[PDB]
């Protein structure tokens, strides 16, 4: 004699906001599913983010291209916050060529079907000379969590070039996740709760797809208790 | 006596870690004791962790 909740409306307030609600919760399971989901979404959602950049005529990070008005040490710290969602493959290799005076927004990356940039109003660098020219070849990967460049070196396998600029990659499509159980109301039941997971992605991953991939990370892990091995 | 010198640099970039010694302005030192995960940190009413 129990009740089990079902998905309900998804008030997509904005592009990076969301509010998914879980209607018919039995009493006592409010804070049990919430905090067991907030600790999953914030931790283990597979995202995609840049892995290693490569510019045309520069050898190391602390250089300074001629024509741009940033050190290369800040062109990598602007790419790392690039949001992109590949659909078909697992990894890509983007491109970027531009020439002229004017800021190089992220929308100038070469267009592909699978790769789909999300924040095209982004800024990457500036160009401030009529004969200036920047031409890089960004990389992209899938994963989860966070893997700094120093620890992704143990699997280097003879990274032959000296033009590869390694970036640290923090794949995760979630930023902050609140939730507040409140007094739901079925037609006749003295106490039924409602969960309201006010999520906030970086425009990458769909809300309803997160929760359906944060539940099966739980429901797949409880097997080891449903069958105690002894 | 010296025949020819050579001078090489190295731009090592060191992150933060347990052991480093942060401190405020008012004379309150402290050695960083642990680097938590993103979600063990006390979150206020709107998820923003300290």
PDB file of C-alpha atoms in Angstrom:
ATOM      1  CA  UNK A   1       0.000   0.000   0.000  1.00  0.00           C
ATOM      2  CA  UNK A   2       2.252   2.772  -1.303  1.00  0.00           C
ATOM      3  CA  UNK A   3       2.233   5.596  -3.825  1.00  0.00           C
ATOM      4  CA  UNK A   4       4.740   6.256  -6.582  1.00  0.00           C
ATOM      5  CA  UNK A   5       5.318   9.642  -8.205  1.00  0.00           C
ATOM      6  CA  UNK A   6       4.960  10.570 -11.852  1.00  0.00           C
ATOM      7  CA  UNK A   7       6.515  13.322 -13.931  1.00  0.00           C
ATOM      8  CA  UNK A   8       4.491  16.505 -14.352  1.00  0.00           C
ATOM      9  CA  UNK A   9       4.722  19.858 -16.180  1.00  0.00           C
ATOM     10  CA  UNK A  10       8.132  21.417 -16.849  1.00  0.00           C
ATOM     11  CA  UNK A  11       7.899  25.196 -16.555  1.00  0.00           C
ATOM     12  CA  UNK A  12      10.796  26.065 -18.851  1.00  0.00           C
ATOM     13  CA  UNK A  13      11.199  29.599 -17.528  1.00  0.00           C
ATOM     14  CA  UNK A  14      14.250  30.425 -19.641  1.00  0.00           C
ATOM     15  CA  UNK A  15      16.877  28.691 -21.736  1.00  0.00           C
ATOM     16  CA  UNK A  16      19.117  27.849 -18.771  1.00  0.00           C
ATOM     17  CA  UNK A  17      16.388  27.582 -16.119  1.00  0.00           C
ATOM     18  CA  UNK A  18      13.813  24.864 -15.487  1.00  0.00           C
ATOM     19  CA  UNK A  19      11.299  23.659 -12.926  1.00  0.00           C
ATOM     20  CA  UNK A  20      10.369  19.978 -13.056  1.00  0.00           C
ATOM     21  CA  UNK A  21       7.846  18.769 -10.497  1.00  0.00           C
ATOM     22  CA  UNK A  22       7.164  15.274  -9.152  1.00  0.00           C
ATOM     23  CA  UNK A  23       3.518  15.229  -8.159  1.00  0.00           C
ATOM     24  CA  UNK A  24       2.327  12.298  -6.018  1.00  0.00           C
ATOM     25  CA  UNK A  25       4.919  11.683  -3.293  1.00  0.00           C
ATOM     26  CA  UNK A  26       4.079   9.602  -0.245  1.00  0.00           C
ATOM     27  CA  UNK A  27       4.769  11.299   3.078  1.00  0.00           C
ATOM     28  CA  UNK A  28       8.359  11.135   4.270  1.00  0.00           C
ATOM     29  CA  UNK A  29       9.866  10.751   0.792  1.00  0.00           C
ATOM     30  CA  UNK A  30      10.149  14.456   0.125  1.00  0.00           C
ATOM     31  CA  UNK A  31      13.656  15.076   1.352  1.00  0.00           C
ATOM     32  CA  UNK A  32      14.715  11.505   0.577  1.00  0.00           C
ATOM     33  CA  UNK A  33      14.462  11.727  -3.203  1.00  0.00           C
ATOM     34  CA  UNK A  34      15.426  15.371  -3.385  1.00  0.00           C
ATOM     35  CA  UNK A  35      18.763  15.284  -1.635  1.00  0.00           C
ATOM     36  CA  UNK A  36      19.480  11.934  -3.236  1.00  0.00           C
ATOM     37  CA  UNK A  37      18.981  13.617  -6.605  1.00  0.00           C
ATOM     38  CA  UNK A  38      20.704  16.913  -5.904  1.00  0.00           C
ATOM     39  CA  UNK A  39      23.798  14.952  -4.984  1.00  0.00           C
ATOM     40  CA  UNK A  40      23.612  13.020  -8.275  1.00  0.00           C
ATOM     41  CA  UNK A  41      22.850  15.810 -10.734  1.00  0.00           C
ATOM     42  CA  UNK A  42      25.525  18.113  -9.362  1.00  0.00           C
ATOM     43  CA  UNK A  43      28.095  15.292  -9.537  1.00  0.00           C
ATOM     44  CA  UNK A  44      27.689  12.889 -12.444  1.00  0.00           C
ATOM     45  CA  UNK A  45      26.027  14.291 -15.466  1.00  0.00           C
ATOM     46  CA  UNK A  46      27.815  13.530 -18.748  1.00  0.00           C
ATOM     47  CA  UNK A  47      28.615  16.710 -20.603  1.00  0.00           C
ATOM     48  CA  UNK A  48      30.951  17.829 -23.356  1.00  0.00           C
ATOM     49  CA  UNK A  49      33.588  20.530 -23.219  1.00  0.00           C
ATOM     50  CA  UNK A  50      36.829  21.549 -24.868  1.00  0.00           C
ATOM     51  CA  UNK A  51      39.842  19.287 -24.428  1.00  0.00           C
ATOM     52  CA  UNK A  52      42.801  20.835 -26.271  1.00  0.00           C
ATOM     53  CA  UNK A  53      43.193  23.892 -28.462  1.00  0.00           C
ATOM     54  CA  UNK A  54      45.768  24.489 -31.179  1.00  0.00           C
ATOM     55  CA  UNK A  55      46.611  27.839 -32.726  1.00  0.00           C
ATOM     56  CA  UNK A  56      48.446  28.416 -35.985  1.00  0.00           C
ATOM     57  CA  UNK A  57      51.661  30.211 -35.150  1.00  0.00           C
ATOM     58  CA  UNK A  58      52.132  29.979 -31.392  1.00  0.00           C
ATOM     59  CA  UNK A  59      54.140  27.441 -29.413  1.00  0.00           C
ATOM     60  CA  UNK A  60      53.096  27.786 -25.776  1.00  0.00           C
ATOM     61  CA  UNK A  61      50.442  29.331 -23.595  1.00  0.00           C
ATOM     62  CA  UNK A  62      52.417  32.324 -22.344  1.00  0.00           C
ATOM     63  CA  UNK A  63      53.074  33.699 -25.813  1.00  0.00           C
ATOM     64  CA  UNK A  64      51.258  36.670 -27.305  1.00  0.00           C
ATOM     65  CA  UNK A  65      49.982  36.619 -30.872  1.00  0.00           C
ATOM     66  CA  UNK A  66      50.464  39.786 -32.911  1.00  0.00           C
ATOM     67  CA  UNK A  67      47.190  41.423 -33.878  1.00  0.00           C
ATOM     68  CA  UNK A  68      45.000  40.089 -31.092  1.00  0.00           C
ATOM     69  CA  UNK A  69      44.660  41.986 -27.826  1.00  0.00           C
ATOM     70  CA  UNK A  70      44.854  39.144 -25.333  1.00  0.00           C
ATOM     71  CA  UNK A  71      47.665  36.914 -24.260  1.00  0.00           C
ATOM     72  CA  UNK A  72      47.062  33.321 -25.264  1.00  0.00           C
ATOM     73  CA  UNK A  73      46.711  32.614 -21.559  1.00  0.00           C
ATOM     74  CA  UNK A  74      43.261  34.254 -21.709  1.00  0.00           C
ATOM     75  CA  UNK A  75      42.114  32.778 -25.023  1.00  0.00           C
ATOM     76  CA  UNK A  76      42.139  29.389 -23.335  1.00  0.00           C
ATOM     77  CA  UNK A  77      40.385  30.680 -20.219  1.00  0.00           C
ATOM     78  CA  UNK A  78      37.588  31.905 -22.498  1.00  0.00           C
ATOM     79  CA  UNK A  79      37.214  28.702 -24.499  1.00  0.00           C
ATOM     80  CA  UNK A  80      36.936  26.577 -21.355  1.00  0.00           C
ATOM     81  CA  UNK A  81      33.586  28.221 -20.713  1.00  0.00           C
ATOM     82  CA  UNK A  82      32.275  27.244 -24.139  1.00  0.00           C
ATOM     83  CA  UNK A  83      29.047  25.241 -24.163  1.00  0.00           C
ATOM     84  CA  UNK A  84      28.470  22.835 -27.044  1.00  0.00           C
ATOM     85  CA  UNK A  85      26.369  19.706 -27.522  1.00  0.00           C
ATOM     86  CA  UNK A  86      27.443  17.088 -30.045  1.00  0.00           C
ATOM     87  CA  UNK A  87      24.684  14.658 -31.018  1.00  0.00           C
ATOM     88  CA  UNK A  88      26.029  11.917 -33.248  1.00  0.00           C
ATOM     89  CA  UNK A  89      29.640  11.182 -32.405  1.00  0.00           C
ATOM     90  CA  UNK A  90      31.632  11.099 -29.174  1.00  0.00           C
ATOM     91  CA  UNK A  91      34.284  13.699 -30.042  1.00  0.00           C
ATOM     92  CA  UNK A  92      34.734  16.368 -32.692  1.00  0.00           C
ATOM     93  CA  UNK A  93      37.412  18.697 -33.973  1.00  0.00           C
ATOM     94  CA  UNK A  94      36.020  22.177 -34.530  1.00  0.00           C
ATOM     95  CA  UNK A  95      37.598  24.974 -36.536  1.00  0.00           C
ATOM     96  CA  UNK A  96      37.718  28.755 -36.439  1.00  0.00           C
ATOM     97  CA  UNK A  97      39.070  31.166 -39.048  1.00  0.00           C
ATOM     98  CA  UNK A  98      38.524  34.908 -39.046  1.00  0.00           C
ATOM     99  CA  UNK A  99      40.260  38.010 -40.349  1.00  0.00           C
ATOM    100  CA  UNK A 100      39.474  41.681 -39.829  1.00  0.00           C
ATOM    101  CA  UNK A 101      38.970  44.204 -37.083  1.00  0.00           C
ATOM    102  CA  UNK A 102      36.218  43.172 -34.699  1.00  0.00           C
ATOM    103  CA  UNK A 103      35.520  40.817 -31.811  1.00  0.00           C
ATOM    104  CA  UNK A 104      35.666  37.111 -32.625  1.00  0.00           C
ATOM    105  CA  UNK A 105      32.441  35.777 -31.206  1.00  0.00           C
ATOM    106  CA  UNK A 106      31.943  32.052 -30.817  1.00  0.00           C
ATOM    107  CA  UNK A 107      29.398  32.065 -33.661  1.00  0.00           C
ATOM    108  CA  UNK A 108      32.192  32.077 -36.261  1.00  0.00           C
ATOM    109  CA  UNK A 109      33.146  28.447 -35.682  1.00  0.00           C
ATOM    110  CA  UNK A 110      32.706  26.430 -38.849  1.00  0.00           C
ATOM    111  CA  UNK A 111      29.220  24.968 -39.115  1.00  0.00           C
ATOM    112  CA  UNK A 112      28.558  21.248 -38.822  1.00  0.00           C
ATOM    113  CA  UNK A 113      25.324  19.313 -38.525  1.00  0.00           C
ATOM    114  CA  UNK A 114      26.067  17.324 -35.379  1.00  0.00           C
ATOM    115  CA  UNK A 115      27.967  19.975 -33.423  1.00  0.00           C
ATOM    116  CA  UNK A 116      25.523  22.600 -32.199  1.00  0.00           C
ATOM    117  CA  UNK A 117      26.814  25.647 -30.346  1.00  0.00           C
ATOM    118  CA  UNK A 118      24.418  27.025 -27.757  1.00  0.00           C
ATOM    119  CA  UNK A 119      25.720  30.483 -26.819  1.00  0.00           C
ATOM    120  CA  UNK A 120      26.549  32.072 -30.194  1.00  0.00           C
ATOM    121  CA  UNK A 121      26.693  35.574 -28.683  1.00  0.00           C
ATOM    122  CA  UNK A 122      29.833  34.507 -26.797  1.00  0.00           C
ATOM    123  CA  UNK A 123      33.096  36.417 -26.996  1.00  0.00           C
ATOM    124  CA  UNK A 124      36.437  34.678 -27.494  1.00  0.00           C
ATOM    125  CA  UNK A 125      39.023  37.333 -28.309  1.00  0.00           C
ATOM    126  CA  UNK A 126      39.392  40.593 -30.197  1.00  0.00           C
ATOM    127  CA  UNK A 127      41.096  41.517 -33.440  1.00  0.00           C
ATOM    128  CA  UNK A 128      42.494  45.004 -33.784  1.00  0.00           C
ATOM    129  CA  UNK A 129      44.435  45.203 -37.044  1.00  0.00           C
ATOM    130  CA  UNK A 130      43.214  45.026 -40.638  1.00  0.00           C
ATOM    131  CA  UNK A 131      45.811  42.404 -41.590  1.00  0.00           C
ATOM    132  CA  UNK A 132      45.288  40.354 -38.435  1.00  0.00           C
ATOM    133  CA  UNK A 133      44.236  36.734 -38.629  1.00  0.00           C
ATOM    134  CA  UNK A 134      43.478  33.991 -36.103  1.00  0.00           C
ATOM    135  CA  UNK A 135      42.969  30.340 -37.010  1.00  0.00           C
ATOM    136  CA  UNK A 136      42.650  27.644 -34.353  1.00  0.00           C
ATOM    137  CA  UNK A 137      41.371  24.061 -34.273  1.00  0.00           C
ATOM    138  CA  UNK A 138      39.397  23.438 -31.097  1.00  0.00           C
ATOM    139  CA  UNK A 139      38.742  19.920 -29.823  1.00  0.00           C
ATOM    140  CA  UNK A 140      35.699  18.572 -27.970  1.00  0.00           C
ATOM    141  CA  UNK A 141      34.974  15.450 -25.926  1.00  0.00           C
ATOM    142  CA  UNK A 142      32.443  13.697 -23.703  1.00  0.00           C
ATOM    143  CA  UNK A 143      32.859  12.673 -20.092  1.00  0.00           C
ATOM    144  CA  UNK A 144      31.827  13.688 -16.626  1.00  0.00           C
ATOM    145  CA  UNK A 145      33.161  15.218 -13.470  1.00  0.00           C
ATOM    146  CA  UNK A 146      36.411  17.106 -13.883  1.00  0.00           C
ATOM    147  CA  UNK A 147      39.839  16.089 -15.172  1.00  0.00           C
ATOM    148  CA  UNK A 148      42.656  18.645 -14.942  1.00  0.00           C
ATOM    149  CA  UNK A 149      45.299  18.765 -17.643  1.00  0.00           C
ATOM    150  CA  UNK A 150      47.985  17.529 -15.266  1.00  0.00           C
ATOM    151  CA  UNK A 151      46.144  14.258 -14.566  1.00  0.00           C
ATOM    152  CA  UNK A 152      45.064  13.718 -18.177  1.00  0.00           C
ATOM    153  CA  UNK A 153      48.804  13.562 -18.893  1.00  0.00           C
ATOM    154  CA  UNK A 154      49.317  10.056 -17.464  1.00  0.00           C
ATOM    155  CA  UNK A 155      47.445   8.827 -20.556  1.00  0.00           C
ATOM    156  CA  UNK A 156      49.430  11.105 -22.866  1.00  0.00           C
ATOM    157  CA  UNK A 157      50.788   8.347 -25.137  1.00  0.00           C
ATOM    158  CA  UNK A 158      53.570  10.398 -26.761  1.00  0.00           C
ATOM    159  CA  UNK A 159      51.821  13.707 -27.465  1.00  0.00           C
ATOM    160  CA  UNK A 160      54.278  14.383 -30.298  1.00  0.00           C
ATOM    161  CA  UNK A 161      53.430  18.036 -31.137  1.00  0.00           C
ATOM    162  CA  UNK A 162      54.692  21.102 -29.327  1.00  0.00           C
ATOM    163  CA  UNK A 163      51.790  23.180 -30.603  1.00  0.00           C
ATOM    164  CA  UNK A 164      49.087  21.450 -28.571  1.00  0.00           C
ATOM    165  CA  UNK A 165      47.811  23.736 -25.834  1.00  0.00           C
ATOM    166  CA  UNK A 166      46.095  21.597 -23.202  1.00  0.00           C
ATOM    167  CA  UNK A 167      43.023  22.967 -21.436  1.00  0.00           C
ATOM    168  CA  UNK A 168      41.465  21.686 -18.252  1.00  0.00           C
ATOM    169  CA  UNK A 169      38.052  20.224 -18.954  1.00  0.00           C
ATOM    170  CA  UNK A 170      35.137  20.426 -16.525  1.00  0.00           C
ATOM    171  CA  UNK A 171      32.302  18.590 -18.242  1.00  0.00           C
ATOM    172  CA  UNK A 172      29.095  19.171 -16.363  1.00  0.00           C
ATOM    173  CA  UNK A 173      25.817  20.655 -17.545  1.00  0.00           C
ATOM    174  CA  UNK A 174      24.508  21.635 -14.084  1.00  0.00           C
ATOM    175  CA  UNK A 175      25.315  24.724 -12.037  1.00  0.00           C
ATOM    176  CA  UNK A 176      22.969  24.954  -9.057  1.00  0.00           C
ATOM    177  CA  UNK A 177      20.020  22.782  -8.093  1.00  0.00           C
ATOM    178  CA  UNK A 178      17.467  23.793  -5.503  1.00  0.00           C
ATOM    179  CA  UNK A 179      14.393  21.853  -4.463  1.00  0.00           C
ATOM    180  CA  UNK A 180      11.556  22.459  -2.028  1.00  0.00           C
ATOM    181  CA  UNK A 181       8.927  19.887  -1.108  1.00  0.00           C
ATOM    182  CA  UNK A 182       5.527  21.496  -0.566  1.00  0.00           C
ATOM    183  CA  UNK A 183       1.953  20.482   0.206  1.00  0.00           C
ATOM    184  CA  UNK A 184       0.699  18.731  -2.894  1.00  0.00           C
ATOM    185  CA  UNK A 185      -2.985  17.852  -3.026  1.00  0.00           C
ATOM    186  CA  UNK A 186      -4.542  14.804  -4.638  1.00  0.00           C
ATOM    187  CA  UNK A 187      -8.349  14.839  -4.572  1.00  0.00           C
ATOM    188  CA  UNK A 188      -8.621  13.070  -1.206  1.00  0.00           C
ATOM    189  CA  UNK A 189      -5.435  12.374   0.756  1.00  0.00           C
ATOM    190  CA  UNK A 190      -4.512  14.169   3.957  1.00  0.00           C
ATOM    191  CA  UNK A 191      -0.790  14.528   3.209  1.00  0.00           C
ATOM    192  CA  UNK A 192       0.847  14.273  -0.214  1.00  0.00           C
ATOM    193  CA  UNK A 193       4.003  16.175  -1.101  1.00  0.00           C
ATOM    194  CA  UNK A 194       5.292  17.822  -4.260  1.00  0.00           C
ATOM    195  CA  UNK A 195       8.924  18.112  -5.304  1.00  0.00           C
ATOM    196  CA  UNK A 196       9.993  21.105  -7.394  1.00  0.00           C
ATOM    197  CA  UNK A 197      13.567  20.768  -8.662  1.00  0.00           C
ATOM    198  CA  UNK A 198      14.458  24.261  -9.801  1.00  0.00           C
ATOM    199  CA  UNK A 199      17.417  23.254 -11.971  1.00  0.00           C
ATOM    200  CA  UNK A 200      19.867  25.426 -13.860  1.00  0.00           C
ATOM    201  CA  UNK A 201      21.931  24.019 -16.716  1.00  0.00           C
ATOM    202  CA  UNK A 202      24.381  25.807 -18.970  1.00  0.00           C
ATOM    203  CA  UNK A 203      21.949  25.556 -21.870  1.00  0.00           C
ATOM    204  CA  UNK A 204      23.321  22.141 -22.807  1.00  0.00           C
ATOM    205  CA  UNK A 205      21.181  19.284 -21.489  1.00  0.00           C
ATOM    206  CA  UNK A 206      17.406  18.981 -21.399  1.00  0.00           C
ATOM    207  CA  UNK A 207      15.829  19.026 -17.934  1.00  0.00           C
ATOM    208  CA  UNK A 208      13.605  15.965 -18.315  1.00  0.00           C
ATOM    209  CA  UNK A 209      16.591  14.070 -19.711  1.00  0.00           C
ATOM    210  CA  UNK A 210      18.699  14.860 -16.656  1.00  0.00           C
ATOM    211  CA  UNK A 211      16.239  13.430 -14.136  1.00  0.00           C
ATOM    212  CA  UNK A 212      15.684  10.353 -16.274  1.00  0.00           C
ATOM    213  CA  UNK A 213      19.460   9.853 -16.225  1.00  0.00           C
ATOM    214  CA  UNK A 214      19.895  10.776 -12.567  1.00  0.00           C
ATOM    215  CA  UNK A 215      17.302   8.271 -11.416  1.00  0.00           C
ATOM    216  CA  UNK A 216      18.801   5.346 -13.301  1.00  0.00           C
ATOM    217  CA  UNK A 217      22.161   6.190 -11.745  1.00  0.00           C
ATOM    218  CA  UNK A 218      20.449   5.526  -8.424  1.00  0.00           C
ATOM    219  CA  UNK A 219      18.122   2.693  -9.464  1.00  0.00           C
ATOM    220  CA  UNK A 220      21.082   0.897 -11.050  1.00  0.00           C
ATOM    221  CA  UNK A 221      23.190   1.259  -7.902  1.00  0.00           C
ATOM    222  CA  UNK A 222      20.664  -0.071  -5.386  1.00  0.00           C
ATOM    223  CA  UNK A 223      20.958  -3.540  -6.919  1.00  0.00           C
ATOM    224  CA  UNK A 224      23.904  -4.332  -4.660  1.00  0.00           C
ATOM    225  CA  UNK A 225      21.550  -3.994  -1.679  1.00  0.00           C
ATOM    226  CA  UNK A 226      18.493  -5.684  -3.189  1.00  0.00           C
ATOM    227  CA  UNK A 227      20.721  -8.772  -3.485  1.00  0.00           C
ATOM    228  CA  UNK A 228      23.051  -8.860  -0.482  1.00  0.00           C
ATOM    229  CA  UNK A 229      25.984 -11.050  -1.519  1.00  0.00           C
ATOM    230  CA  UNK A 230      27.223 -11.976   1.971  1.00  0.00           C
TER     231      UNK A 230
ATOM    232  CA  UNK B   1      87.578  30.526 -17.452  1.00  0.00           C
ATOM    233  CA  UNK B   2      83.915  30.223 -18.394  1.00  0.00           C
ATOM    234  CA  UNK B   3      83.426  29.174 -22.007  1.00  0.00           C
ATOM    235  CA  UNK B   4      79.718  29.611 -22.685  1.00  0.00           C
ATOM    236  CA  UNK B   5      76.652  29.908 -20.476  1.00  0.00           C
ATOM    237  CA  UNK B   6      73.063  28.855 -21.138  1.00  0.00           C
ATOM    238  CA  UNK B   7      69.947  29.994 -19.288  1.00  0.00           C
ATOM    239  CA  UNK B   8      66.604  28.205 -19.540  1.00  0.00           C
ATOM    240  CA  UNK B   9      63.262  29.152 -18.016  1.00  0.00           C
ATOM    241  CA  UNK B  10      60.195  27.181 -16.984  1.00  0.00           C
ATOM    242  CA  UNK B  11      56.691  28.555 -16.511  1.00  0.00           C
ATOM    243  CA  UNK B  12      55.295  26.112 -14.005  1.00  0.00           C
ATOM    244  CA  UNK B  13      51.661  26.764 -13.057  1.00  0.00           C
ATOM    245  CA  UNK B  14      50.727  25.559  -9.581  1.00  0.00           C
ATOM    246  CA  UNK B  15      47.113  25.064  -8.524  1.00  0.00           C
ATOM    247  CA  UNK B  16      45.813  25.076  -4.962  1.00  0.00           C
ATOM    248  CA  UNK B  17      45.863  22.083  -2.676  1.00  0.00           C
ATOM    249  CA  UNK B  18      45.930  20.854   0.938  1.00  0.00           C
ATOM    250  CA  UNK B  19      48.879  22.483   2.688  1.00  0.00           C
ATOM    251  CA  UNK B  20      48.750  25.919   1.051  1.00  0.00           C
ATOM    252  CA  UNK B  21      48.370  28.800   3.465  1.00  0.00           C
ATOM    253  CA  UNK B  22      45.505  31.166   2.742  1.00  0.00           C
ATOM    254  CA  UNK B  23      44.805  34.140   4.981  1.00  0.00           C
ATOM    255  CA  UNK B  24      42.523  37.154   5.149  1.00  0.00           C
ATOM    256  CA  UNK B  25      43.467  40.751   5.804  1.00  0.00           C
ATOM    257  CA  UNK B  26      42.833  40.732   9.568  1.00  0.00           C
ATOM    258  CA  UNK B  27      45.557  38.307  10.580  1.00  0.00           C
ATOM    259  CA  UNK B  28      43.662  35.020  10.444  1.00  0.00           C
ATOM    260  CA  UNK B  29      45.923  32.497   8.763  1.00  0.00           C
ATOM    261  CA  UNK B  30      45.033  28.898   8.071  1.00  0.00           C
ATOM    262  CA  UNK B  31      46.296  25.910   6.134  1.00  0.00           C
ATOM    263  CA  UNK B  32      43.763  24.530   3.666  1.00  0.00           C
ATOM    264  CA  UNK B  33      42.528  21.309   5.251  1.00  0.00           C
ATOM    265  CA  UNK B  34      40.504  19.663   2.492  1.00  0.00           C
ATOM    266  CA  UNK B  35      39.059  20.259  -0.951  1.00  0.00           C
ATOM    267  CA  UNK B  36      35.421  19.108  -0.777  1.00  0.00           C
ATOM    268  CA  UNK B  37      33.223  18.088  -3.693  1.00  0.00           C
ATOM    269  CA  UNK B  38      30.743  20.529  -5.150  1.00  0.00           C
ATOM    270  CA  UNK B  39      27.778  19.145  -3.234  1.00  0.00           C
ATOM    271  CA  UNK B  40      29.015  18.397   0.277  1.00  0.00           C
ATOM    272  CA  UNK B  41      29.119  22.117   0.922  1.00  0.00           C
ATOM    273  CA  UNK B  42      26.295  23.746   2.911  1.00  0.00           C
ATOM    274  CA  UNK B  43      23.795  25.093   0.405  1.00  0.00           C
ATOM    275  CA  UNK B  44      21.442  27.908   1.332  1.00  0.00           C
ATOM    276  CA  UNK B  45      17.811  28.246   0.276  1.00  0.00           C
ATOM    277  CA  UNK B  46      18.703  28.509  -3.445  1.00  0.00           C
ATOM    278  CA  UNK B  47      21.384  25.878  -3.921  1.00  0.00           C
ATOM    279  CA  UNK B  48      24.309  28.303  -3.952  1.00  0.00           C
ATOM    280  CA  UNK B  49      26.996  26.461  -1.965  1.00  0.00           C
ATOM    281  CA  UNK B  50      29.407  28.357   0.206  1.00  0.00           C
TER     282      UNK B  50
END
